[PDB]
Amino acid sequence: MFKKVLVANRGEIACRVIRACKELGIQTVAIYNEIESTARHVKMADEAYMIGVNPLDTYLNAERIVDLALEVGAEAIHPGYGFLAENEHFARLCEEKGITFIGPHWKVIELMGDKARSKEVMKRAGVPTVPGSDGILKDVEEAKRIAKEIGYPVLLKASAGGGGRGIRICRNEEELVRNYENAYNEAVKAFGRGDLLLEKYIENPKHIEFQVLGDKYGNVIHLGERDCSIQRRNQKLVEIAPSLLLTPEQREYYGSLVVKAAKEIGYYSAGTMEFIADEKGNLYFIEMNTRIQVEHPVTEMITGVDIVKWQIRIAAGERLRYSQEDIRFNGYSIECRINAEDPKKGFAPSIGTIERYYVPGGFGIRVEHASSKGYEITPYYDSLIAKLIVWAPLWEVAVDRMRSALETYEISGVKTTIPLLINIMKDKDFRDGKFTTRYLEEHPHVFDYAE
Amino acid sequence: AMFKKVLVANRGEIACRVIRACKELGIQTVAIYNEIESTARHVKMADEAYMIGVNPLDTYLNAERIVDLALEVGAEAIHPGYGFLAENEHFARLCEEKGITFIGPHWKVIELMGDKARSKEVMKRAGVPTVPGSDGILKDVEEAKRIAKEIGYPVLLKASRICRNEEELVRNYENAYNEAVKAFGRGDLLLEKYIENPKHIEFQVLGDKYGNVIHLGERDCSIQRRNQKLVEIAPSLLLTPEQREYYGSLVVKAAKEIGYYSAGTMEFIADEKGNLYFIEMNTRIQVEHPVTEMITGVDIVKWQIRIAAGERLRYSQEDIRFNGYSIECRINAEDPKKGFAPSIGTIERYYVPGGFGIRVEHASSKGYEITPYYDSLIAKLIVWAPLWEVAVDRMRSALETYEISGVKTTIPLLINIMKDKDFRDGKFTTRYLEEHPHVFDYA
């Protein structure tokens, strides 16, 4: 077990890691920028060092961080999420200097950081991806055949022109033909080459993600899935575990598949496979995060597994003491991001100073936060004030508990997402499990609230 | 028949606890407060709040004004919390007479189990062991002589000081009859077997209004001073599963014999071997109920509310399992270096810890003012883990990050208790604080 760990992060995730280390009996080192000399994670660590020439260089200067670790005798670095956590060169430099990086091997971080090289890994493991042409379409006949084979609707896009002159949705064969001609000709005009690619169109999808955890001896489990469809611009606002979409059979089927894929690339530590999903529970792989997920607590609440503490144990060489048979899914857990942003104005950040600040607690309530009165939201760092997490045996009780917790979470000095989140908990569609990404676009009333 | 509106006749953390249970149930809430508490958390959390009372205690102790307010605002029920009027039979009778549902046991049960001698006889008929000693007031010193011979040394004299042999017997008896005449007007003394190195062990009961009564295991609240609990655990490390079900069965049997419903606690002293002797019953929610919630999954307060509205308790004893260990620490505004004297002042810096296995019961923010009129409790910090040792580490690590300035608190003492070897090994009695003075050594 490590004697000292350095947390190359800030805010709530630094406090989460620091708490896991203290529980393990591990000494901790924090890093900070001078504009946050009073930061909570600084007070919580056994040792703290101001480094960096500006607020971001503190957390992004790989060489400065590995060097500080060597100076102060830290055997391992936890990177949290964001900043350098999925930076293969930071992980490689840790290994080269004899410091253990708490995460997957640097070669896996590099592998899964590339979109298409990630898609192929998952295809080769048997993890479903979005179907479509296996490159350029030979002709219109083949487009008709393939569209028939993967199911309408589908997308046609020109192959040339770097990005894309514009994608066309085709709902039936007739539309496929018209759109094939129009796109072929517009692409001859624009780039000189009419060749088209085809893709299955997943309309109005949900965001569903699976959690994996592996030790450095090939033992790898899944911790079921989360639904994080309630998001704007790919920023998640509400995350639930498990999904309401999937049955136990689907859950173990896809879970088995991501375990299979993780084993084939030699994954260890924590990781997440994010998918889009249709109404029927068909999932398609989009991307993998090779780090702790922000919303990992909801998975912790329903499985009993302490993911961060197991990252640290795994990095130190311990075996994962679980078989998949041990992993059970009990009740439901909801997490809401309490952000300093204004949902009535496009979620514009609300920089300022927290004045009133009362944290909720109770049966089934957990708070991940690093704020008190006087906490300053600067433009340098993300807008997150707190993650409010609840657990209950029944979905509806979980919703009521999250509503009642939010209604008691008092924050003044900045605008927050709390009133919007309360409206979501009170919304009939949300209570009935009916939401996709796009939930917010399709429910504008949740933006109606007092000042 | 679920209530539409409930009035919470209490303040502070327990009021917030009840209000949260009510909000989750979809019940409108009414708070009461004194003018010195215009900004109190429970006022802010409730849907409705009323300033009443001619002084800070009158707010919560004037039964008639509170019942009349409930009728005025259309509250169907009153939750009394703990302390104040919670175990006041007259308050409960007054609710029943005016058509208000009191969230608790029937007022006749509150009257019964508030009486030491009636409580003892309840337990004698149920088969629940009591402390051996005199069978009422001692007739004289001669009768005390017989009773001491029969029950075994050591023994105690107490009015309605340890006595190990006959000399000490008379010597302490003349002086003690006289010293109790001085103070209470009545010299009547009782004698009791002296239990050396005792633990405090409490059993939780929960009953519905249809005769169904369950127990929710036990708690060890031995870490205490002058009977003020500081650390509470569930379950005990003392009892085995068989002892737990044996004593649990007995307290269920007693409760059924008195027709108990709602939540209640049977407090016992226990000797080295796990023998229990009944001391008293609280006919109300316990302060340290959360540790029991953490290990059983049962929401005790919300079940009080459901039971009072006429629901059946949806559990048999076979469903009640005890999973892991839960520790609660009372974080009080008091100074353990000066005999735990209250530390009045205003909270300045205030960071609540959170995380996996952490729960906080509190009603404070920056600016919360600790007055002399009310108890000193700032927060209850509760943790759970699958294993005792991890629970201790989790509480130690939660306490070390719980930052409170502006007043003195029990936090440094609690941290030292969490890192003390004896405590970690389960080795503690009600004398723990006397026997470990080093825990008072801190800056």
Swiss-Prot record, chain A:
Residue span(s) of domain Biotin carboxylation: 1-445
Q: Cite the active-site annotation.
A: R291
Q: Where does the ATP-grasp domain start and stop, copy by copy?
A: 119-316
List residues binding ATP.
Answer: K115, E199
Q: Does the keyword Nucleotide-binding apply?
A: yes
Q: Name one molecular function that GO assigns to this entry.
A: 2-oxoglutarate carboxylase activity
Q: Name one Pfam family in it.
A: Biotin_carb_N
Q: Which reaction does it catalyse?
A: hydrogencarbonate + 2-oxoglutarate + ATP = (S)-oxalosuccinate + ADP + phosphate + H(+)
Q: Does the keyword ATP-binding apply?
A: yes
Q: What is its EC number?
A: 6.4.1.7
**How does this chain assemble?**
Heterohexadecamer of 8 large subunits and 8 small subunits.
Provide the protein name. Answer: 2-oxoglutarate carboxylase small subunit
Source organism (scientific name): Hydrogenobacter thermophilus (strain DSM 6534 / IAM 12695 / TK-6)
Gene name as annotated: cfiB
